[PDB]
Write a protein that binds this ligand. Sequence first.
Ligand SMILES: *[C@@H]1O[C@H](CO)[C@@H](O[C@@H]2O[C@H](CO)[C@@H](O[C@@H]3O[C@H](CO)[C@@H](O)[C@H](O)[C@@H]3O)[C@H](O)[C@H]2NC(C)=O)[C@H](O)[C@H]1NC(C)=O
Ligand SMILES: *[C@@H]1O[C@H](CO)[C@@H](O[C@@H]2O[C@H](CO)[C@@H](O[C@@H]3O[C@H](CO)[C@@H](O)[C@H](O)[C@@H]3O)[C@H](O)[C@H]2NC(C)=O)[C@H](O)[C@H]1NC(C)=O
Ligand SMILES: *[C@@H]1O[C@H](CO)[C@@H](O[C@@H]2O[C@H](CO)[C@@H](O[C@@H]3O[C@H](CO)[C@@H](O)[C@H](O)[C@@H]3O)[C@H](O)[C@H]2NC(C)=O)[C@H](O)[C@H]1NC(C)=O
Ligand SMILES: *[C@@H]1O[C@H](CO)[C@@H](O[C@@H]2O[C@H](CO)[C@@H](O[C@@H]3O[C@H](CO)[C@@H](O)[C@H](O)[C@@H]3O)[C@H](O)[C@H]2NC(C)=O)[C@H](O)[C@H]1NC(C)=O
Ligand SMILES: *[C@@H]1O[C@H](CO)[C@@H](O[C@@H]2O[C@H](CO)[C@@H](O)[C@H](O)[C@H]2NC(C)=O)[C@H](O)[C@H]1NC(C)=O
Ligand SMILES: *[C@@H]1O[C@H](CO)[C@@H](O[C@@H]2O[C@H](CO)[C@@H](O)[C@H](O)[C@H]2NC(C)=O)[C@H](O)[C@H]1NC(C)=O
Ligand SMILES: *[C@@H]1O[C@H](CO)[C@@H](O[C@@H]2O[C@H](CO)[C@@H](O)[C@H](O)[C@H]2NC(C)=O)[C@H](O)[C@H]1NC(C)=O
Ligand SMILES: *[C@@H]1O[C@H](CO)[C@@H](O[C@@H]2O[C@H](CO)[C@@H](O)[C@H](O)[C@H]2NC(C)=O)[C@H](O)[C@H]1NC(C)=O
Ligand SMILES: *[C@@H]1O[C@H](CO)[C@@H](O[C@@H]2O[C@H](CO)[C@@H](O)[C@H](O)[C@H]2NC(C)=O)[C@H](O)[C@H]1NC(C)=O
Ligand SMILES: *[C@@H]1O[C@H](CO)[C@@H](O[C@@H]2O[C@H](CO)[C@@H](O)[C@H](O)[C@H]2NC(C)=O)[C@H](O)[C@H]1NC(C)=O
Ligand code: NAG
Ligand code: NAG
Lengths: 614, 614
Amino acid sequence: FAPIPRITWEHREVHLVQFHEPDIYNYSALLLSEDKDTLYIGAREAVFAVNALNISEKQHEVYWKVSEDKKAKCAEKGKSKQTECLNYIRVLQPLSATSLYVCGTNAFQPACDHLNLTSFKFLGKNEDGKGRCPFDPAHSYTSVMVDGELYSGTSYNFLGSEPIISRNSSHSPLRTEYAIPWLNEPSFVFADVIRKGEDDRVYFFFTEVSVEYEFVFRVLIPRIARVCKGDQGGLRTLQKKWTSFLKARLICSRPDSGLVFNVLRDVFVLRSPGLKVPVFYALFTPQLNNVGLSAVCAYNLSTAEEVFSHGKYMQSTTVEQSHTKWVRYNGPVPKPRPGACIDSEARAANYTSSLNLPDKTLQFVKDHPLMDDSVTPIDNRPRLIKKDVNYTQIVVDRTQALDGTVYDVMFVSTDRGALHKAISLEHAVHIIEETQLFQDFEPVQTLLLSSKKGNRFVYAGSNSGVVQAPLAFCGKHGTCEDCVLARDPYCAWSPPTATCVALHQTESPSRGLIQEMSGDASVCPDYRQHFFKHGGTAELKCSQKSNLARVFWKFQNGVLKAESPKYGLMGRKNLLIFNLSEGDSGVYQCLSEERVKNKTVFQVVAKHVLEVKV
Amino acid sequence: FAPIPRITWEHREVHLVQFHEPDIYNYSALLLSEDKDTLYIGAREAVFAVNALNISEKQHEVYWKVSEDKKAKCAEKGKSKQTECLNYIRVLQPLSATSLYVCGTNAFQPACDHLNLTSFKFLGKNEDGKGRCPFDPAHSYTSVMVDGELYSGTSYNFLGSEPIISRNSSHSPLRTEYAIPWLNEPSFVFADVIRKGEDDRVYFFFTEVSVEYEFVFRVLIPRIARVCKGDQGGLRTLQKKWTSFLKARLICSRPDSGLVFNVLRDVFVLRSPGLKVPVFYALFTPQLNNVGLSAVCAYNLSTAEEVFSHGKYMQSTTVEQSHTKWVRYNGPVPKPRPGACIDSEARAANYTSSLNLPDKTLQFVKDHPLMDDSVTPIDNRPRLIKKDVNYTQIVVDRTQALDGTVYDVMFVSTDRGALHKAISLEHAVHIIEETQLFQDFEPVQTLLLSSKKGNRFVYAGSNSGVVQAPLAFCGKHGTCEDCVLARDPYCAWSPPTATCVALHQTESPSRGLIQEMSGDASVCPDYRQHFFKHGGTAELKCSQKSNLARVFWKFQNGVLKAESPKYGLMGRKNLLIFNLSEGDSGVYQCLSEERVKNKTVFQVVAKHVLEVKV
Ligand SMILES: *[C@@H]1O[C@H](CO)[C@@H](O[C@@H]2O[C@H](CO)[C@@H](O[C@@H]3O[C@H](CO)[C@@H](O)[C@H](O)[C@@H]3O)[C@H](O)[C@H]2NC(C)=O)[C@H](O)[C@H]1NC(C)=O
Ligand SMILES: *[C@@H]1O[C@H](CO)[C@@H](O[C@@H]2O[C@H](CO)[C@@H](O[C@@H]3O[C@H](CO)[C@@H](O)[C@H](O)[C@@H]3O)[C@H](O)[C@H]2NC(C)=O)[C@H](O)[C@H]1NC(C)=O
Ligand SMILES: *[C@@H]1O[C@H](CO)[C@@H](O[C@@H]2O[C@H](CO)[C@@H](O[C@@H]3O[C@H](CO)[C@@H](O)[C@H](O)[C@@H]3O)[C@H](O)[C@H]2NC(C)=O)[C@H](O)[C@H]1NC(C)=O
Ligand SMILES: *[C@@H]1O[C@H](CO)[C@@H](O[C@@H]2O[C@H](CO)[C@@H](O[C@@H]3O[C@H](CO)[C@@H](O)[C@H](O)[C@@H]3O)[C@H](O)[C@H]2NC(C)=O)[C@H](O)[C@H]1NC(C)=O
Ligand SMILES: *[C@@H]1O[C@H](CO)[C@@H](O[C@@H]2O[C@H](CO)[C@@H](O)[C@H](O)[C@H]2NC(C)=O)[C@H](O)[C@H]1NC(C)=O
Ligand SMILES: *[C@@H]1O[C@H](CO)[C@@H](O[C@@H]2O[C@H](CO)[C@@H](O)[C@H](O)[C@H]2NC(C)=O)[C@H](O)[C@H]1NC(C)=O
Ligand SMILES: *[C@@H]1O[C@H](CO)[C@@H](O[C@@H]2O[C@H](CO)[C@@H](O)[C@H](O)[C@H]2NC(C)=O)[C@H](O)[C@H]1NC(C)=O
Ligand SMILES: *[C@@H]1O[C@H](CO)[C@@H](O[C@@H]2O[C@H](CO)[C@@H](O)[C@H](O)[C@H]2NC(C)=O)[C@H](O)[C@H]1NC(C)=O
Ligand SMILES: *[C@@H]1O[C@H](CO)[C@@H](O[C@@H]2O[C@H](CO)[C@@H](O)[C@H](O)[C@H]2NC(C)=O)[C@H](O)[C@H]1NC(C)=O
Ligand SMILES: *[C@@H]1O[C@H](CO)[C@@H](O[C@@H]2O[C@H](CO)[C@@H](O)[C@H](O)[C@H]2NC(C)=O)[C@H](O)[C@H]1NC(C)=O
Ligand SMILES: *[C@@H]1O[C@H](CO)[C@@H](O)[C@H](O)[C@H]1NC(C)=O
Ligand SMILES: *[C@@H]1O[C@H](CO)[C@@H](O)[C@H](O)[C@H]1NC(C)=O
């Protein structure tokens, strides 16, 4: 299990910019512009444009509030008039340079519209968002705009009994089948297009009730799925339906410890400036006995692609003679491959679209959407497993250290408004710091990263507002030792400026900078006076930031024992000399000790010169 | 989830009698005599007889140490010469008035013998305990002596690859089949005879790899099983094999919370003086994501009896065409019923023993040992679910309160040498107290209850020694309020003696005693002076035992705020007045507040009269 966050930053001790509109709640949708300087917020009954560099600067505002006759219609359907019967923005996507595509629950009448960016006024397109947007603010939902066409995963109805992964195309509308083999009680988590003869694919991530597994209760299972951008459906069968829909198990577990995380919470696509293949960073929690635990598994796209392209499918079979069981299909697979895209191979066999695929192949995919092979993580284990924390959303920044060693920086939000910064150091997790983003411990519902030159920020939304944080707080570190010991690839010590700087931001010289991810503060170069009355009591204040260090006191060059009657420890860090007399005068030193590898790192926290009067 | 233990007793603050022999370890077997005054301890390479009333009084001792040629033989087989290659006592059972039946691992040569009680010397019977006793001190094991015949569940071999539930009878030896349907990687937990035409039954409890369930990893499942005392095996088939072996799922879970506890740790049989039917109190932990959690489920014997007597069996089937799946069997069941005992019905159809049962019935049971129905707990939920605690063994005492309301008192041991006392109050768990039995936090391996008049004790064994504790510490409670607030059915307040007494032990008058399980201390009838120097500092000590209460201070009839500079709180309970002056003199009161139901209970903990000198 991952250790405790090395340093805890109170909302008070760091520079965090906040945004909220009075009487406006549920800041669940976040979208930043092309230029990255304008962040758009989708809340309950409102859409805003804020300066992404200072979220507190409100630029534009637009509302989409529900009428009383629509609220009462919703309430008459036994829903909560002042809770669920309101317009929760669920779809906030780029449409053009001059517009956004917006959908809201709208007292259970999913409605879509175009937000005119030049005016920040809605165009009144008033489209029926049934299938595109959920009815209930409680229902799961995911959407990705690909080539001005919305690819959405949510419920097709009011009750949330009909799930749907569909494309609102207008030219070629396509949707999933309303069948258990296709989708079995899913809870949508994330979707994105993975761009390139070879066609683009639109991946979907969700948790659904498993068909392959049987246990005491119904077992959930994380799913990775994909569809082909060029899909047009089948001609005779799969009319207006996906022909390219294949899914597989997403497995996040440490078995030598019986830890299985079968509930997917978030998915982030690490788009490597260097690496040609994207890495999905997926966030999971266990369905069973969650108390709570969180795990972060990283999946190489190539792995998943290997399953969808060459993996054996699963067959459903009748078993004695009213039951259905699912097993590996070892029978003959049709050609062209069921679920495959219109690639170079297909085009050679005179196949231009799904509309001209053989009925043999189309029937196969319709009856075999599920793959036998699981999609496994890189190094076949989670990147991080944490206890006593319920992680909510994830973002990852691939950063180059001073050394040139590349670290994948994990920003993980909690259900209590906190953000953890973690890196997988040499075969062990290091949680650099934790920051309390929300003073009200509101769970971070959404998280969004901008790693772009200048505007390097993380944006977190909750029901109470939005928070803007940098990727590091290098300046909070006082000494070179403190700067190095942090083991943050973002932070380096600058001897000329006598400040711990943010490497890859500051205008300090690279060649003349200090950073050691080993934590060996050895690479570094290197008195509060008091006058108290006789008989009186002294409180010598001492504090440090490491949650992984312990402090001890020293008087007259010896390790002082804070025991009654002469001594006491107030708050485990502040020394208390009780009965002051001639001999108590002199130097009192507060020291810290923290283990890095095998070695211990002692640091002098406080220096005190106590003088007792006569 | 169950709250935290109301009061924590340090090993220091309670009267606990301890026993251990220098250089003797692993005190895993405990057996008390008929008279209940002599407790026999089975350790590694030794057996002792101690006064059960004062375990520290060693009465008798006997050793059974392994020879160097036997240790070296064991070590040559790649085992640990100074760890596993020693005689761990595994079987410590009553044989007669003048003898005990003892088996030890014996450097992987399971050996049995008779301990002559009149001499406390072994008889040298030197029986081969293969099947009766495990080879490895790591292997699971269970045994019950029924009518001078040992019924044992353990491994049949060195590697622990062959499991076995068998009867060392001499007249009619019987054992299980070495087949997955019968036993699939079991870990034995407990066994006992459930006594009465109707035959007696010998129940077995264990955890084994499930055949009915399929998940990411192999799923374990707790099992309740039984065999008939009168079994003699089959004549043509099941030659020297159990014909009465039936098993079923033992289910301990809260599903509205996704909590499943599929690993059985201990089983206790509540033999009710009043209730005609015994209740099994079973202790479970989860296989998946245990961090750790413990649950206590109580099962009514009648329920289990209903499954074994009328439940539909499970069939194994071939599925496409190399796999095996298990489903409910809805086909024709033979008569006499497979797995049933030789009852009144069978005897009418001229069946005297298993040896004369039709081959039809015998073949059925051999191919269908597993039942389709699960054995569920009373009120279909656990009696207790606890987090942050790994419970090891359980005992239950059915006790009558002053009111006459019967409480089933749960004594639960932990893997850190602690004992919790819990009762299921009105639809909520109340953990009365917790006691640190082992100063070395050694896990309690075995637990044994003597609820008998006079000698009312709990005996706990660990690798470091044995501990003797009473069932209550009524005397530790100071006031009537404190006595009542404890909500311990064992404790009552005595106004004449001004002491909190143990109801059903003391010679105090029943009619003139105070006890309220509601916790309403309203039924009850109803100054440390200091003189400190001017300018000096005062520490006003205040403490109480409730882990569920918080203390606040009062000065000059007002709730004082322990904030800098004038005030401070040392250890969250001790008040610190910093700069003494004329006005600081007077009465300082430490008060406690604890919620019972809705209401708060304020109590005056400490009274102080502080006088500041001039
Ligand atoms: C994600 O999965 C892809 C799929 O294989 C990984 O890519 C491949 O990794 C292998 C492993 O070495 C490469 O093979 C060879 O690399 C050595 C190293 O220099 C080279 O000397 C050999 O001549 C050969 O090229 C393979 O080329 C490479 N292919 C691609 C397209 O990347 C990828 O590394 C995985 N990424 C992660 C983070 O797991
Ligand atoms: C949108 O944001 C608002 C802002 O907090 C969320 O409001 C909160 O709603 C919950 C109920 O869903 C309130 O909890 C209470 O639950 C008990 C249980 O029955 C009920 O008896 C109480 O009357 C109350 O509803 C919570 O107090 C409330 N917060 C505030 C400040 O009023 C809202 O739930 C969010 N909606 C979504 C879809 O996230
Ligand atoms: C354990 O399971 C047994 C199996 O049923 C339970 O025993 C039975 O409980 C029923 C429930 O009432 C008894 O039926 C009736 O009880 C009422 C109460 O006075 C009486 O007025 C009716 O005339 C009738 O007797 C049934 O007789 C009883 N049978 C036996 C053998 O006990 C038992 O109570 C369960 N114990 C626990 C702790 O769950
Ligand atoms: C019987 O009781 C003794 C008394 O404590 C138990 O002794 C303990 O045995 C464990 C190993 O099983 C020792 O732990 C260590 O494990 C590491 C891991 O490789 C190893 O490198 C060390 O050399 C050592 O073996 C533990 O220190 C030891 N306790 C003492 C005081 O020596 C014994 O395990 C118990 N046997 C059974 C079957 O319960
Ligand atoms: C989007 O909003 C802009 C903002 O007004 C609209 O711009 C006006 O467009 C009309 C022609 O249609 C011009 O005559 C006005 O002078 C424009 N005003 C401004 C301030 O630019 C634009 O038309 C809107 N687009 C749509 C589709 O409604
Ligand atoms: C969602 O589907 C509707 C259904 O057609 C699309 O609506 C058409 O939109 C185009 C402009 O993009 C208009 O020219 C057509 O006249 C519209 N027809 C109808 C019937 O509405 C809509 O554009 C789709 N939206 C997205 C984001 O894909
Ligand atoms: C982690 O999240 C779980 C829920 O997923 C929390 O468990 C709930 O805690 C509340 C608080 O009293 C209880 O009322 C609920 O009944 C609990 N539900 C379940 C399923 O346990 C858990 O407390 C959280 N823990 C941490 C460390 O974040
Ligand atoms: C059990 O131990 C007792 C203790 O000695 C044995 O008792 C002796 O028995 C012999 C006859 O066999 C008598 O002559 C001795 O006088 C007895 N001595 C005592 C002290 O009682 C007894 O024999 C042992 N039982 C077995 C089976 O060996
Ligand atoms: C375990 O099985 C052995 C096998 O027979 C039993 O041994 C017999 O024990 C009786 C006395 O109980 C002797 O009279 C016989 O001569 C013994 N025969 C053999 C071959 O040993 C043994 O008693 C059984 N033990 C238990 C506790 O049931
Ligand atoms: C409860 O028991 C579990 C084991 O069943 C403990 O978990 C182990 O804790 C040690 C301590 O560092 C680790 O080294 C092991 O790797 C852990 N194993 C597993 C499977 O988690 C757990 O810490 C115990 N917790 C409590 C509160 O008793
Ligand atoms: C932008 O941030 C600065 C930094 O303190 C602040 O002074 C300024 O008022 C902010 N702008 C707005 C509109 O809040
Ligand atoms: C029995 O317990 C008493 C109580 O203190 C003790 O004094 C006595 O020595 C114990 N007996 C033995 C043999 O330890």
